[PDB]
Design a protein around this motif. Sequence first.
Motif, short mmCIF file in Angstrom:
data_model
loop_
_atom_site.label_atom_id
_atom_site.label_comp_id
_atom_site.label_asym_id
_atom_site.label_seq_id
_atom_site.Cartn_x
_atom_site.Cartn_y
_atom_site.Cartn_z
N UNK A 2 7.70 -17.22 19.28
CA UNK A 2 6.29 -17.10 19.60
C UNK A 2 6.12 -16.93 21.11
N UNK A 3 5.52 -15.80 21.48
CA UNK A 3 5.29 -15.50 22.88
C UNK A 3 3.88 -14.94 23.07
N UNK A 4 3.47 -14.87 24.33
CA UNK A 4 2.15 -14.36 24.66
C UNK A 4 1.99 -14.18 26.17
N UNK A 5 0.77 -13.87 26.57
CA UNK A 5 0.48 -13.66 27.98
C UNK A 5 -1.04 -13.61 28.20
N UNK A 6 -1.43 -13.80 29.45
CA UNK A 6 -2.84 -13.77 29.80
C UNK A 6 -3.07 -12.83 30.98
N UNK A 7 -4.34 -12.52 31.21
CA UNK A 7 -4.70 -11.64 32.30
C UNK A 7 -5.22 -12.43 33.51
N UNK A 8 -5.67 -11.69 34.51
CA UNK A 8 -6.19 -12.31 35.72
C UNK A 8 -7.37 -11.48 36.25
N UNK A 9 -8.11 -12.08 37.16
CA UNK A 9 -9.26 -11.41 37.75
C UNK A 9 -9.09 -11.30 39.26
N UNK A 10 -9.89 -10.42 39.86
CA UNK A 10 -9.83 -10.22 41.29
C UNK A 10 -11.24 -10.32 41.90
N UNK A 11 -11.49 -11.45 42.54
CA UNK A 11 -12.78 -11.69 43.16
C UNK A 11 -12.57 -12.21 44.59
N UNK A 12 -13.62 -12.10 45.38
CA UNK A 12 -13.56 -12.55 46.76
C UNK A 12 -13.27 -14.05 46.82
N UNK A 13 -12.39 -14.42 47.74
CA UNK A 13 -12.02 -15.81 47.90
C UNK A 13 -11.58 -16.05 49.35
N UNK A 14 -12.40 -16.82 50.06
CA UNK A 14 -12.11 -17.13 51.45
C UNK A 14 -11.41 -18.49 51.55
N UNK A 15 -10.11 -18.47 51.32
CA UNK A 15 -9.32 -19.69 51.38
C UNK A 15 -7.83 -19.33 51.34
N UNK A 16 -7.01 -20.27 51.77
CA UNK A 16 -5.57 -20.07 51.79
C UNK A 16 -5.09 -19.60 50.42
N UNK A 17 -4.38 -18.48 50.42
CA UNK A 17 -3.86 -17.92 49.19
C UNK A 17 -2.36 -18.21 49.10
N UNK A 18 -1.82 -18.02 47.91
CA UNK A 18 -0.41 -18.26 47.67
C UNK A 18 0.16 -17.21 46.72
N UNK A 19 1.48 -17.09 46.74
CA UNK A 19 2.16 -16.13 45.88
C UNK A 19 3.61 -16.54 45.64
N UNK A 20 4.21 -15.92 44.63
CA UNK A 20 5.59 -16.21 44.29
C UNK A 20 6.51 -15.11 44.82
N UNK A 21 7.78 -15.46 44.94
CA UNK A 21 8.77 -14.52 45.44
C UNK A 21 9.99 -14.53 44.52
N UNK A 22 10.51 -13.33 44.26
CA UNK A 22 11.66 -13.19 43.39
C UNK A 22 12.95 -13.17 44.22
#
Length: 104
Positions: A2-22
């Motif tokens: 059993x597997x799945x996935x979800x989506x994401x949205x893109x809206x204005x955000x004035x704050x420290x952001x983060x991301x992952x690295x491979x």
Amino acid sequence: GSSGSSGDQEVRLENRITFQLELVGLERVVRISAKPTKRLQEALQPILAKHGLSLDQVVLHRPGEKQPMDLENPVSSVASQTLVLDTPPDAKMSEARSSGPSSG
């Protein structure tokens, strides 16, 4: 199973952001947090200098690209999906140690 996935949205955000690295070279997903305004090089500055790396040592480029992304770009544009890091074929001064030879 059993597997799945979800989506994401893109809206204005004035704050420290983060991301992952491979860690292609390695085997684990790392996270990077820093202001958006800042660039990808300036945000990695405290990362490379904290990882004994450099901006002219590592290479940023999303998974499945043609060329290496431009750090000049703000992390605010790299705060959604996971990026990939293409470390150089040589590293001594760094945390942990797990690498093997190769031939063809």
